[PDB]
Amino acid sequence: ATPTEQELRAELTGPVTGAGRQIHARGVWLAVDDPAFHLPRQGWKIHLSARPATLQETIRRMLPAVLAVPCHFKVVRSGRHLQDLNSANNHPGSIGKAVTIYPSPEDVAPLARRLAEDLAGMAGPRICSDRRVRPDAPVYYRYGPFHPCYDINDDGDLELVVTDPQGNTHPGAADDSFWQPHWSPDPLTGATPHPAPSDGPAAPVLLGGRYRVVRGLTRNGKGCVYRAIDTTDNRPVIIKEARAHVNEDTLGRDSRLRLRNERYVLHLLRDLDDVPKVIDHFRHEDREYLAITDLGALALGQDVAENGLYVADPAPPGRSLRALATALLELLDHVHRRGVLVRDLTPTNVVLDDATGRPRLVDFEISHAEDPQLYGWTPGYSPPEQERDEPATVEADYYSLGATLFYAATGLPPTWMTGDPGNHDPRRAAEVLAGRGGMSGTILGLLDPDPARRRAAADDIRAGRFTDAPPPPPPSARQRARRLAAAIAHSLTELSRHAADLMSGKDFTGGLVGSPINLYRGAAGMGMELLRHDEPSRALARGLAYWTGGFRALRNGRPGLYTGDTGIAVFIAEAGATLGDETLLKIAEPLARPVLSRITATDQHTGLAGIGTGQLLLWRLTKDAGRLELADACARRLLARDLTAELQENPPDYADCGAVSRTLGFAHGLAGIVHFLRDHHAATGETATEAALHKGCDTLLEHLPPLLEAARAVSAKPMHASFCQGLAGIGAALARTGRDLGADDHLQAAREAAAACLELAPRMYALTQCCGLAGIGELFLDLCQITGDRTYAQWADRIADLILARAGGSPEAPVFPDTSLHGSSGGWSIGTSGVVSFLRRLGDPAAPRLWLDPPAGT
């Protein structure tokens, strides 16, 4: 059913040595190399789809043609590799890419047609990202790079690209749909038409059952689920899609078989009105679709998002944690009466009703019917047993329900890190949960390691009143400082690890690579943080600095401070300065010197404002007058435009939280511009900048009240409190303006902002500086230093405790999630180095905030 690498290797090595080609194996591929073929760098490649069961014969029928003409080709290493590859949890864009063939253009269309007829009637996962030769065959073709050429995008990230006859890069996105180059003709058709023709359509739809899809409720994984209007009944419904041979189980079980599992489970739950009901099940070609009644919009996850949390019973009408718990459990017990174990009972599978009886379940794809259960688990909410695929159990469902509650009560899911032993530790969850909610002890009992405790707590719920447990109390202060020390130490060594993986190239694979250099995520931020510590870390910072200087030479760049070269230069210069290293200063001396005649952005993140702040940092470091001149150019270029008049013209247009950022926030809007202008006025003290500063600060205080209204509201989205986009950034700018301008009303704005932040802190979805707790605590100790209060010191220490209790790993060896909950990385804005910056400044109050303050040593 699934061949070995050696069966494949025999099948191949036979003929391949017959045409004088040699096999070498790398990654997941076995690549056979014709020595007489010179592989161009991009063009039309051919993909063959197959399945472990059919890969061996695919190679069989393939070898004649591929070995007839000069070409290069790669075959997946083994059957388990192909299973990984046709699973959507892996690389959704590489499903079906069993065999790849790179031939001469002249030979592409023929080679493609032949193989097509030579396969034909063979079956495999359709490739959305390619065109198709014949709809009875598993042969496909596309235009893409043949060698990893990487260009920089506006985010500072690197992506694969092909080059046109004018030399312009173009993301050869393999993940995305098929892509037509304007400069080369489809080898089979013989024409060059693009698909941007008909992107105007409001909808097109027209399903096999004649169902009108309007919007799609996610596309991730094996299949995509769509919102349908329906044309006969014209009552709205949800349609789930299955793609053939995608997610083949070790027993040959398909996505379509999972969808039929859903149909069967729903059939068994027909008498309940809290289950979607089957309504229709149809197909065509090798795409299948199942249509069920739409129960409502907004899931439980979204519900706790756009509305609020579920709390103790005397709370807002919708909000009653005990009500939600009991309703869920009554529906669940009804389901149990029919057998049918849910297995994926998660906030995303509970859809709420306009009635008081809200809870309803909508996806039992991997549910229990017969004993051959389906494998599948949702991180954090599913129990450990289910990861190990123990037989279906009612107690496993009780665990998942106890996690669904927990989310409902804290707004976020339990911390769960791939590879972490601590994963399902129930007391670790206790720390994140401070006793908020009525059935606190019950929620913890449903998450216990022993299924007996989960059973007992579910019966306790059912019996009547629920267990209300107080927080696990911290009886110690100094020992908390010990924990802080442990966090910093282990994060330092973990950084060493991320840095080694970075400079050795381990993570450079992919159709998109995170910037390996810049502040936001690459080396610069890592090394800046590593500089503040002891000499092992300073040494790693020196290594990172030289590595960045080298990587930067003779490739594309962007001028950014956070995304681009200005932050890079700041880091290299500062590393030279602190280490006593003059050649690092010489390496930095020529770096960030863009034309400001281009650069159409005004922005701390990638624009004139951040360029200016960075050049002022460089100047203060190097005493280089060109750096001050560039800061001056940035300010003059900013002042030439009248952004504020356009703000006062049309202020609250397209109003939603995201919109706030692009206007007012530190990362992309006015707060960061104001920070830069205050810095320029501090550096020079020119009147024009101070006038601009006053205009901008007033324009800020004018629009702050509505943003604070939203930030104190029920919705209380996190972006409101984030540093990049919301109140932490605005407050961090105004603490400094009100300091340096002796304007107390500015300081007052900052204080009230910090307060709103402190209220949202616990619900924040990240520990990181850009989008999470780090920015908040950074603001707090800003205010401490500025306003000898110390109550802000307590505020920051609280945030530190929150970060700690939401960390992964053990107490003495913790790891912190990045923007992707079950993962760890060294990115400053989005990863562990920023967390470290905060935890460090907590122990050194009178030390500067990175990039926001100037440096001072002696």
Partner: peptide, 11 residues
């Protein structure tokens, strides 16, 4: 499991 309904459909 078994069964599925095939209707010509559109692309």
């Amino acid at each position: 499991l078994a069964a599925i309904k095939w209707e010509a459909p559109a692309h």
